[PDB]
PDB file of all heavy atoms in Angstrom:
ATOM      1  N   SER S1308      -9.825  85.488 -36.682  1.00  2.00           N
ATOM      2  CA  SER S1308     -10.186  86.689 -37.438  1.00  2.00           C
ATOM      3  C   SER S1308     -11.358  86.418 -38.374  1.00  2.00           C
ATOM      4  O   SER S1308     -12.236  87.303 -38.571  1.00  2.00           O
ATOM      5  CB  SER S1308      -9.001  87.233 -38.218  1.00  2.00           C
ATOM      6  OG  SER S1308      -8.694  86.451 -39.347  1.00  2.00           O
ATOM      7  N   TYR S1309     -11.436  85.206 -38.906  1.00  2.00           N
ATOM      8  CA  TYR S1309     -12.554  84.792 -39.739  1.00  2.00           C
ATOM      9  C   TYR S1309     -13.840  84.783 -38.912  1.00  2.00           C
ATOM     10  O   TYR S1309     -14.885  85.262 -39.379  1.00  2.00           O
ATOM     11  CB  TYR S1309     -12.281  83.406 -40.360  1.00  2.00           C
ATOM     12  CG  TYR S1309     -13.371  82.913 -41.284  1.00  2.00           C
ATOM     13  CD1 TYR S1309     -13.354  83.214 -42.629  1.00  2.00           C
ATOM     14  CD2 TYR S1309     -14.402  82.118 -40.800  1.00  2.00           C
ATOM     15  CE1 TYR S1309     -14.362  82.772 -43.488  1.00  2.00           C
ATOM     16  CE2 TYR S1309     -15.402  81.647 -41.641  1.00  2.00           C
ATOM     17  CZ  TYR S1309     -15.374  81.985 -42.980  1.00  2.00           C
ATOM     18  OH  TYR S1309     -16.368  81.506 -43.785  1.00  2.00           O
ATOM     19  N   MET S1310     -13.760  84.266 -37.690  1.00  2.00           N
ATOM     20  CA  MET S1310     -14.924  84.149 -36.829  1.00  2.00           C
ATOM     21  C   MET S1310     -15.406  85.543 -36.475  1.00  2.00           C
ATOM     22  O   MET S1310     -16.582  85.842 -36.568  1.00  2.00           O
ATOM     23  CB  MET S1310     -14.651  83.328 -35.563  1.00  2.00           C
ATOM     24  CG  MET S1310     -15.758  83.367 -34.532  1.00  2.00           C
ATOM     25  SD  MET S1310     -15.722  84.796 -33.414  1.00  2.00           S
ATOM     26  CE  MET S1310     -14.169  84.497 -32.538  1.00  2.00           C
ATOM     27  N   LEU S1311     -14.473  86.403 -36.103  1.00  2.00           N
ATOM     28  CA  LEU S1311     -14.843  87.746 -35.680  1.00  2.00           C
ATOM     29  C   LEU S1311     -15.350  88.558 -36.874  1.00  2.00           C
ATOM     30  O   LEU S1311     -16.329  89.273 -36.752  1.00  2.00           O
ATOM     31  CB  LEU S1311     -13.672  88.445 -34.993  1.00  2.00           C
ATOM     32  CG  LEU S1311     -13.389  87.931 -33.571  1.00  2.00           C
ATOM     33  CD1 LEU S1311     -12.059  88.470 -33.098  1.00  2.00           C
ATOM     34  CD2 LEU S1311     -14.522  88.320 -32.626  1.00  2.00           C
ATOM     35  N   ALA S1312     -14.713  88.446 -38.027  1.00  2.00           N
ATOM     36  CA  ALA S1312     -15.188  89.133 -39.218  1.00  2.00           C
ATOM     37  C   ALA S1312     -16.638  88.758 -39.584  1.00  2.00           C
ATOM     38  O   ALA S1312     -17.451  89.616 -39.930  1.00  2.00           O
ATOM     39  CB  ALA S1312     -14.266  88.858 -40.393  1.00  2.00           C
ATOM     40  N   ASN S1313     -16.975  87.485 -39.478  1.00  2.00           N
ATOM     41  CA  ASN S1313     -18.303  87.085 -39.843  1.00  2.00           C
ATOM     42  C   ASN S1313     -19.305  87.432 -38.765  1.00  2.00           C
ATOM     43  O   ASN S1313     -20.409  87.814 -39.072  1.00  2.00           O
ATOM     44  CB  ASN S1313     -18.325  85.600 -40.158  1.00  2.00           C
ATOM     45  CG  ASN S1313     -17.870  85.330 -41.558  1.00  2.00           C
ATOM     46  OD1 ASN S1313     -18.661  85.429 -42.488  1.00  2.00           O
ATOM     47  ND2 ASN S1313     -16.593  85.046 -41.723  1.00  2.00           N
ATOM     48  N   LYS S1314     -18.912  87.306 -37.500  1.00  2.00           N
ATOM     49  CA  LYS S1314     -19.871  87.596 -36.420  1.00  2.00           C
ATOM     50  C   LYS S1314     -20.077  89.078 -36.169  1.00  2.00           C
ATOM     51  O   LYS S1314     -21.103  89.465 -35.602  1.00  2.00           O
ATOM     52  CB  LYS S1314     -19.439  86.863 -35.159  1.00  2.00           C
ATOM     53  CG  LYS S1314     -19.554  85.353 -35.348  1.00  2.00           C
ATOM     54  CD  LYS S1314     -20.092  84.659 -34.135  1.00  2.00           C
ATOM     55  CE  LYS S1314     -20.321  83.190 -34.413  1.00  2.00           C
ATOM     56  NZ  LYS S1314     -21.737  82.930 -34.768  1.00  2.00           N
ATOM     57  N   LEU S1315     -19.127  89.903 -36.577  1.00  2.41           N
ATOM     58  CA  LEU S1315     -19.251  91.346 -36.342  1.00  2.41           C
ATOM     59  C   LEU S1315     -19.598  92.145 -37.602  1.00  2.41           C
ATOM     60  O   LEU S1315     -19.732  93.379 -37.516  1.00  2.41           O
ATOM     61  CB  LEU S1315     -17.967  91.870 -35.741  1.00  2.41           C
ATOM     62  CG  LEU S1315     -17.574  91.360 -34.345  1.00  2.41           C
ATOM     63  CD1 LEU S1315     -16.188  91.874 -34.040  1.00  2.41           C
ATOM     64  CD2 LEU S1315     -18.562  91.784 -33.272  1.00  2.41           C
ATOM     65  N   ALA S1316     -19.735  91.468 -38.746  1.00  2.93           N
ATOM     66  CA  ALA S1316     -20.046  92.116 -40.021  1.00  2.93           C
ATOM     67  C   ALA S1316     -21.328  92.910 -39.893  1.00  2.93           C
ATOM     68  O   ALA S1316     -22.269  92.427 -39.308  1.00  2.93           O
ATOM     69  CB  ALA S1316     -20.187  91.100 -41.126  1.00  2.93           C
ATOM     70  N   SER S1317     -21.329  94.118 -40.449  1.00  5.57           N
ATOM     71  CA  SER S1317     -22.535  94.937 -40.476  1.00  5.57           C
ATOM     72  C   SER S1317     -22.489  95.782 -41.765  1.00  5.57           C
ATOM     73  O   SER S1317     -21.482  95.792 -42.459  1.00  5.57           O
ATOM     74  CB  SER S1317     -22.622  95.806 -39.217  1.00  5.57           C
ATOM     75  OG  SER S1317     -21.597  96.768 -39.217  1.00  5.57           O
ATOM     76  N   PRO S1318     -23.582  96.460 -42.109  1.00  9.68           N
ATOM     77  CA  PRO S1318     -23.545  97.295 -43.313  1.00  9.68           C
ATOM     78  C   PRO S1318     -22.429  98.331 -43.240  1.00  9.68           C
ATOM     79  O   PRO S1318     -21.722  98.613 -44.230  1.00  9.68           O
ATOM     80  CB  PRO S1318     -24.911  97.992 -43.292  1.00  9.68           C
ATOM     81  CG  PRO S1318     -25.799  97.018 -42.604  1.00  9.68           C
ATOM     82  CD  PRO S1318     -24.948  96.335 -41.564  1.00  9.68           C
ATOM     83  N   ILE S1319     -22.238  98.801 -42.003  1.00 11.41           N
ATOM     84  CA  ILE S1319     -21.285  99.832 -41.672  1.00 11.41           C
ATOM     85  C   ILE S1319     -19.863  99.294 -41.898  1.00 11.41           C
ATOM     86  O   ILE S1319     -19.012  99.934 -42.543  1.00 11.41           O
ATOM     87  CB  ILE S1319     -21.491 100.237 -40.162  1.00 11.41           C
ATOM     88  CG1 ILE S1319     -22.875 100.886 -39.913  1.00 11.41           C
ATOM     89  CG2 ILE S1319     -20.420 101.202 -39.724  1.00 11.41           C
ATOM     90  CD1 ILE S1319     -24.116  99.979 -39.823  1.00 11.41           C
ATOM     91  N   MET S1320     -19.606  98.083 -41.398  1.00 15.15           N
ATOM     92  CA  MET S1320     -18.296  97.487 -41.551  1.00 15.15           C
ATOM     93  C   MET S1320     -18.486  96.038 -41.945  1.00 15.15           C
ATOM     94  O   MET S1320     -18.752  95.207 -41.098  1.00 15.15           O
ATOM     95  CB  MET S1320     -17.504  97.596 -40.248  1.00 15.15           C
ATOM     96  CG  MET S1320     -16.949  98.971 -39.978  1.00 15.15           C
ATOM     97  SD  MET S1320     -16.015  99.032 -38.421  1.00 15.15           S
ATOM     98  CE  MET S1320     -17.299  98.746 -37.228  1.00 15.15           C
ATOM     99  N   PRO S1321     -18.386  95.744 -43.248  1.00 14.36           N
ATOM    100  CA  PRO S1321     -18.654  94.367 -43.652  1.00 14.36           C
ATOM    101  C   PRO S1321     -17.522  93.436 -43.266  1.00 14.36           C
ATOM    102  O   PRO S1321     -16.518  93.883 -42.685  1.00 14.36           O
ATOM    103  CB  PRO S1321     -18.812  94.480 -45.175  1.00 14.36           C
ATOM    104  CG  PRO S1321     -19.118  95.925 -45.420  1.00 14.36           C
ATOM    105  CD  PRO S1321     -18.249  96.632 -44.417  1.00 14.36           C
ATOM    106  N   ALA S1322     -17.662  92.151 -43.593  1.00 12.01           N
ATOM    107  CA  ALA S1322     -16.747  91.121 -43.152  1.00 12.01           C
ATOM    108  C   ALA S1322     -15.265  91.452 -43.433  1.00 12.01           C
ATOM    109  O   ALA S1322     -14.438  91.366 -42.534  1.00 12.01           O
ATOM    110  CB  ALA S1322     -17.102  89.778 -43.775  1.00 12.01           C
ATOM    111  N   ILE S1323     -14.947  91.811 -44.683  1.00  8.43           N
ATOM    112  CA  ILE S1323     -13.548  92.067 -45.048  1.00  8.43           C
ATOM    113  C   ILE S1323     -13.005  93.256 -44.265  1.00  8.43           C
ATOM    114  O   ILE S1323     -11.866  93.199 -43.797  1.00  8.43           O
ATOM    115  CB  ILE S1323     -13.333  92.269 -46.554  1.00  8.43           C
ATOM    116  CG1 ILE S1323     -13.510  90.930 -47.267  1.00  8.43           C
ATOM    117  CG2 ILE S1323     -11.917  92.779 -46.826  1.00  8.43           C
ATOM    118  CD1 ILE S1323     -13.616  91.049 -48.766  1.00  8.43           C
TER     119      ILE S1323
END
Side-chain angles (χ1 to χ4, degrees):
Chain S
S1308 75
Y1309 182 89
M1310 171 276 295
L1311 285 169
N1313 278 276
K1314 293 220 174 263
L1315 296 172
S1317 67
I1319 295 78
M1320 283 180 294
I1323 289 168

